[PDB]
Design an enzyme around this catalytic site. Structure first.
Site, PDB file in Angstrom:
ATOM      1  N   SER A  20       7.025  -8.683   0.309  1.00 59.09           N
ATOM      2  CA  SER A  20       7.311  -8.336   1.694  1.00 59.09           C
ATOM      3  C   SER A  20       6.475  -9.112   2.699  1.00 59.09           C
ATOM      4  O   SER A  20       6.874  -9.207   3.865  1.00 59.09           O
ATOM      5  CB  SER A  20       7.094  -6.833   1.911  1.00 59.09           C
ATOM      6  OG  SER A  20       5.707  -6.526   1.944  1.00 59.09           O
ATOM      7  N   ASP A  48      -8.764  20.005   0.551  1.00 62.94           N
ATOM      8  CA  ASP A  48      -9.904  19.837  -0.342  1.00 62.94           C
ATOM      9  C   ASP A  48     -10.362  18.390  -0.376  1.00 62.94           C
ATOM     10  O   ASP A  48     -11.565  18.115  -0.474  1.00 62.94           O
ATOM     11  CB  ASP A  48      -9.547  20.298  -1.749  1.00 62.94           C
ATOM     12  CG  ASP A  48      -9.137  21.741  -1.795  1.00 62.94           C
ATOM     13  OD1 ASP A  48      -9.998  22.644  -1.581  1.00 62.94           O
ATOM     14  OD2 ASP A  48      -7.928  21.957  -2.035  1.00 62.94           O
ATOM     15  N   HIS A  66       0.816  -1.199   0.000  1.00 64.91           N
ATOM     16  CA  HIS A  66       0.000   0.000   0.000  1.00 64.91           C
ATOM     17  C   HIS A  66       0.855   1.256   0.000  1.00 64.91           C
ATOM     18  O   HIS A  66       0.741   2.077  -0.908  1.00 64.91           O
ATOM     19  CB  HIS A  66      -0.927  -0.014   1.211  1.00 64.91           C
ATOM     20  CG  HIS A  66      -1.898  -1.147   1.203  1.00 64.91           C
ATOM     21  ND1 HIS A  66      -3.212  -0.996   0.832  1.00 64.91           N
ATOM     22  CD2 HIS A  66      -1.736  -2.457   1.483  1.00 64.91           C
ATOM     23  CE1 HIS A  66      -3.825  -2.159   0.910  1.00 64.91           C
ATOM     24  NE2 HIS A  66      -2.949  -3.063   1.299  1.00 64.91           N
ATOM     25  N   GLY A  98       1.490  -5.307  -7.080  1.00 58.97           N
ATOM     26  CA  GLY A  98       2.642  -4.466  -7.341  1.00 58.97           C
ATOM     27  C   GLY A  98       3.722  -5.211  -8.092  1.00 58.97           C
ATOM     28  O   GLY A  98       4.344  -4.668  -9.007  1.00 58.97           O
ATOM     29  N   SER A  99       3.949  -6.469  -7.718  1.00 54.35           N
ATOM     30  CA  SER A  99       4.959  -7.293  -8.368  1.00 54.35           C
ATOM     31  C   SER A  99       4.558  -7.666  -9.781  1.00 54.35           C
ATOM     32  O   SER A  99       5.429  -7.886 -10.630  1.00 54.35           O
ATOM     33  CB  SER A  99       5.200  -8.549  -7.548  1.00 54.35           C
ATOM     34  OG  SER A  99       5.434  -8.187  -6.206  1.00 54.35           O
TER      35      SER A  99
HETATM   36  C1  LIG Z   1      -1.879  -7.105  -3.640  1.00 56.93           C
HETATM   37  C2  LIG Z   1      -1.236  -6.731  -2.306  1.00 56.93           C
HETATM   38  O1  LIG Z   1      -0.238  -7.695  -1.986  1.00 56.93           O
HETATM   39  C3  LIG Z   1       0.475  -7.339  -0.802  1.00 56.93           C
HETATM   40  O2  LIG Z   1       1.659  -7.992  -0.480  1.00 56.93           O
HETATM   41  P1  LIG Z   1       3.016  -7.297  -1.162  1.00 56.93           P
HETATM   42  O3  LIG Z   1       3.699  -6.327  -0.197  1.00 56.93           O
HETATM   43  O4  LIG Z   1       4.045  -8.332  -1.621  1.00 56.93           O
HETATM   44  O5  LIG Z   1       2.419  -6.429  -2.430  1.00 56.93           O
HETATM   45  P2  LIG Z   1       3.243  -6.201  -3.845  1.00 56.93           P
HETATM   46  O6  LIG Z   1       2.068  -5.915  -4.791  1.00 56.93           O
HETATM   47  O7  LIG Z   1       4.081  -7.425  -4.253  1.00 56.93           O
HETATM   48  O8  LIG Z   1       4.317  -4.884  -3.721  1.00 56.93           O
HETATM   49  C4  LIG Z   1       5.038  -4.684  -2.507  1.00 56.93           C
HETATM   50  C5  LIG Z   1       6.310  -3.852  -2.853  1.00 56.93           C
HETATM   51  O9  LIG Z   1       7.572  -4.357  -1.988  1.00 56.93           O
HETATM   52  C6  LIG Z   1       8.738  -4.306  -2.979  1.00 56.93           C
HETATM   53  N1  LIG Z   1       9.865  -5.132  -2.437  1.00 56.93           N
HETATM   54  C7  LIG Z   1       9.610  -6.195  -1.702  1.00 56.93           C
HETATM   55  C8  LIG Z   1      10.661  -6.912  -1.189  1.00 56.93           C
HETATM   56  C9  LIG Z   1      11.963  -6.486  -1.446  1.00 56.93           C
HETATM   57  O10 LIG Z   1      13.087  -7.157  -0.955  1.00 56.93           O
HETATM   58  N2  LIG Z   1      12.140  -5.401  -2.173  1.00 56.93           N
HETATM   59  C10 LIG Z   1      11.115  -4.746  -2.648  1.00 56.93           C
HETATM   60  O11 LIG Z   1      11.356  -3.777  -3.288  1.00 56.93           O
HETATM   61  C11 LIG Z   1       8.208  -4.639  -4.135  1.00 56.93           C
HETATM   62  O12 LIG Z   1       8.978  -4.089  -5.219  1.00 56.93           O
HETATM   63  C12 LIG Z   1       6.874  -3.990  -3.943  1.00 56.93           C
HETATM   64  O13 LIG Z   1       6.998  -2.567  -3.891  1.00 56.93           O
HETATM   65  C13 LIG Z   1      -0.446  -7.236   0.417  1.00 56.93           C
HETATM   66  O14 LIG Z   1      -0.883  -8.538   0.795  1.00 56.93           O
HETATM   67  C14 LIG Z   1      -1.654  -6.360   0.111  1.00 56.93           C
HETATM   68  O15 LIG Z   1      -2.603  -6.473   1.158  1.00 56.93           O
HETATM   69  C15 LIG Z   1      -2.279  -6.802  -1.201  1.00 56.93           C
HETATM   70  O16 LIG Z   1      -3.381  -5.963  -1.517  1.00 56.93           O
END
Ligand SMILES: C[C@@H]1O[C@H](OP(=O)(O)OP(=O)(O)OC[C@H]2O[C@@H](n3ccc(=O)[nH]c3=O)[C@H](O)[C@@H]2O)[C@H](O)[C@H](O)[C@H]1O
Length: 415
Positions: A243, A115, A17, A316-317
């Site tokens: 993470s 706002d 998030h 995000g991944s």
């Molecule tokens: C769908 C979402 O998935 C989530 O888990 P997560 O944190 O893995 O989410 P990511 O979309 O992978 O993104 C998380 C972000 O951590 C980054 N990263 C992680 C490990 C590392 O060693 N280095 C990094 O840069 C990665 O690049 C990313 O930014 C949660 O369950 C959330 O509730 C859910 O809605």
């Protein structure tokens, strides 16, 4: 002039998030907005990078102590250090930031009132109540996509997401980090059935400024000169479950076995747990690297010779991997991961599934071959994703759905 808004941004304390919500913060900042970011003290570090890129007159920080909770270890203010199931108390604690906020807003000059509130949909129950009491729009942010939302909002037993899900509907609008083209069917499904004011913005892929949240563990220059010096432009497979996940030792031995057997070169990102190793191989298999802690995920996924990514298929991944131009190897385990698999793997044929469950252990021999063949650009799963990257990368260029949507959003924030 062309009036711009004052936005009170409230992220959710968790990488999935927090990370795009600041990317979304930087995007509205660039459209000449003014932001006040509300965090607890241990979360003020993630704003540093963002602070070095904006004036203290355009970027403001409100800091409130983390309301203490019996079920959360002292001094922890971010869920990424906790079991994702612990999120239920994180909701409880953060909801007590409601009263400090009202005092801040009440004692704020009538002029300087925001706002709009651009807060986490996960905090939308109480952010909405604060939003109503000052006649301020409460736009919600979510890191997941319209597909997941439709499956999730429609549940009969929601369960403890209910209040936040139904409060998200009672919001002004919703901002999500995917694009229209990706899932047009569902963006519309969310806009009409699950948004009482029928406003949704697709602004993704939110890609990062300038790194990301927050600091890697092996120094990224040691990483980058491991990559430049490995031979072929699409032959390193990066392994990382983001993470929120930490895997059991039985699976580690199986996952490590495939890598030893696969003959491919790789980086593996293992993480930590909190509540209050493979065996030998770190120097048995060069190349080669095992970044423990937190790793340069985006520098790695966009590096030239990284062609495959084995992930939980977090949203995000998915977007980092897609932008990076890398084949997705999907192993869903919890959260929105399955909805991601239904859309990306099943529906669009843009990732190869390589694991089934939160508990799975794979055929060491099967996984090794999927891993060997995974980087080669021929596969119809890679090209279908390289096509989607084409659609995603231009939906964020000027005139794209997401460039426009962010514009229309910053605007509607002022109304
Ligand atoms: C769908 C979402 O998935 C989530 O888990 P997560 O944190 O893995 O989410 P990511 O979309 O992978 O993104 C998380 C972000 O951590 C980054 N990263 C992680 C490990 C590392 O060693 N280095 C990094 O840069 C990665 O690049 C990313 O930014 C949660 O369950 C959330 O509730 C859910 O809605």
């Amino acid at each position: 002039t062309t009036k711009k808004p004052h936005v009170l941004v409230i992220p959710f304390p968790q990488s999935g998030h927090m990370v795009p919500h600041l990317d979304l913060t930087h995007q509205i900042l660039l459209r000449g907005a003014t932001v006040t970011v509300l965090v607890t003290p241990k979360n003020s570090s993630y704003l540093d990078a963002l602070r070095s890129l904006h004036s203290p007159e355009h970027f403001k920080t409100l800091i409130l102590p983390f309301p203490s909770h019996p079920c959360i270890p002292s001094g922890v203010e971010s869920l990424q250090q906790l079991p994702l199931e612990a999120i239920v108390h994180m909701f409880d604690a953060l909801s007590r930031l409601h009263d400090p906020l009202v005092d801040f807003l009440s004692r704020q000059p009538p002029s300087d009132l925001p706002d709009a509130i651009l807060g986490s949909s996960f905090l939308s129950p109480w952010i909405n109540k604060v939003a109503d009491a000052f006649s301020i729009k409460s736009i919600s942010f979510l890191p997941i996509n319209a597909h997941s939302i439709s499956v999730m909002w429609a549940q009969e037993d929601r369960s403890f997401f209910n209040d936040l899900e139904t409060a998200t509907t009672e919001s002004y609008g919703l901002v999500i980090n995917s694009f229209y083209d990706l899932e047009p069917e569902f963006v519309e499904t969310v806009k009409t059935r699950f948004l009482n004011h029928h406003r949704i913005w697709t602004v993704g892929p939110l890609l990062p400024f300038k790194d990301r949240g927050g600091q890697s563990s092996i120094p990224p220059a040691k990483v980058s000169a491991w990559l430049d010096s490995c031979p072929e432009d699409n032959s390193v497979v990066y392994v990382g479950f983001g993470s929120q996940i930490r895997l059991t030792a039985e699976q580690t031995a199986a996952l490590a076995a495939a890598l030893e057997k696969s003959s491919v070169r790789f980086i593996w990102a293992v993480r930590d747990a909190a509540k209050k190793p493979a065996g030998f191989e770190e120097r048995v298999k060069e190349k080669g690297l095992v970044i423990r802690g937190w790793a340069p995920q985006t520098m790695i996924l966009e590096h030239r010779a990284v062609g495959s990514y084995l992930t939980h298929l977090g949203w995000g991944s998915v977007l980092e991997g897609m932008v990076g131009g890398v084949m997705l190897l999907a192993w869903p385990m919890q959260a929105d991961h399955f909805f991601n698999t239904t859309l990306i793997v099943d529906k669009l044929r843009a990732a190869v599934r390589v694991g089934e469950n939160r508990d799975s252990v794979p055929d060491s021999d099967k996984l090794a071959r999927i891993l060997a063949e995974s980087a080669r650009e021929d596969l119809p799963e890679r090209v279908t994703l390289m096509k989607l990257r084409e659609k995603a990368m231009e939906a964020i260029k000027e005139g794209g759905s997401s460039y426009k949507n962010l514009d229309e959003l910053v605007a509607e924030m002022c109304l």
